[model samples]
Target chain A: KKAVINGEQIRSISDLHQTLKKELALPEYYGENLDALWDALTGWVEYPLVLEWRQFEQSKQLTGAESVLQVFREAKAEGADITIILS
Target chain B: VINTFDGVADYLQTYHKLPDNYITKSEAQALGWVASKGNLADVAPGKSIGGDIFSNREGKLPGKSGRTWREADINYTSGFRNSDRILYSSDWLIYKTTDHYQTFTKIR
Candidate 1:
């Protein structure tokens, strides 16, 4: 599955999670946090997931921004079939 | 306004709102707050984080029409935002969660 996340629409970590939940069709039990994001990306989402984050710099000022991004990077490193594109 | 559990709870019970020191998550982020770093004091001094809506997706708390819930930190000193939080409802009901919403005890 492919999901395009527009950072311009993200104002905070919660906003980012809300978008991800919708775009990725995460389960209702998804806990909107870094740990939960890691779990969903690494364990729940379909394989060969493509996450395209456009205008990513717009969300840099949000709290926990680095941690959120780190979750994605870590998920990929942990052998999750994920491709992250940041622009 | 104080930052302790009793202090914030009493204040909310009396004023129906958070203390002056409590700031919304968005407001704190605008001032450079980073949750992983718990830098609220560094970015916005004298502020205890709060005023963010708490979506009770688990249905652990009471639910009713026109009832909404919000969360606030309690006894936050520094480092990271601990599991301690006070959940307040639009109907003026207050609940305390010390384990990050795993469980809650009604305060008011």
Candidate 2:
């Protein structure tokens, strides 16, 4: 399955939280950090997932962008089927 | 149609205009270009067009009040962001670069 996080729509960390929540079950007060994001994608999600990042040049939040990449990297290391495509 | 910085600079010098591929920031935004994430081809098609006013925040370029600057991004294909761009002013100061705005060569 695939999930797309459009940078036009996702302008910040809070926006990421909401988008992920819509796609997967997330705990209240999800830390909204890299570690919390990684757990939600690898632990809570039951299927292989590909996350597509698009329209990044529009907002290009450096830390948020890095943090999102970290989640996908960690998922890959932990043997999860989560992947990220940056555009 | 634009390949070399000189090509673009010459075209602008002769025509006093931006390439047909270039669009203003507002125009691109109207077509749904989010600078943070560039996916214009998905929605706006073709290479990344020059849009948005370059704030010149680094002040690397000479600036004066009442003079505004704009940017023209080149080499953006589909998903990945291209670091190359040309920055120009209404007063005719044009700069070209392959290093995203880290360095620039005066063209005009």
Which one wins on DockQ? Answer: 1
Complex DockQ, candidate 1: 0.05
Model 1 in CAPRI terms: which quality?
incorrect
Local error of candidate 1 at A12, Å? 29
Tens digits of per-residue lDDT, candidate 2, B42-101, equal 767764566456656446778988888777766656653455677778787888766545
lDDT by residue (A31-83, candidate 1, tens digit) is 67654464356334666779898878887776466677777886688666778
| Sequence-dependent TM-score of model 1 | 0.57
Which parts of model 2 have CA positions greater than 4 angstroms off? Answer: A1-87, B34-38
How would you encode candidate 1's per-residue C-alpha lDDT over B15-83 as one tens digit per residue? 888889988765875787655455778987788778877767457889999999888888886655655
Q: Which candidate has the highest TM-score of all? A: 1
Error of 1 at B103 (Å): 0.5
RMSD for each of the candidates: 12.9, 14.5
Local accuracy by lDDT, each model? 0.75, 0.63
- Please state the interface RMSD for every predicted structure, separated by commas: 9.5, 15.0
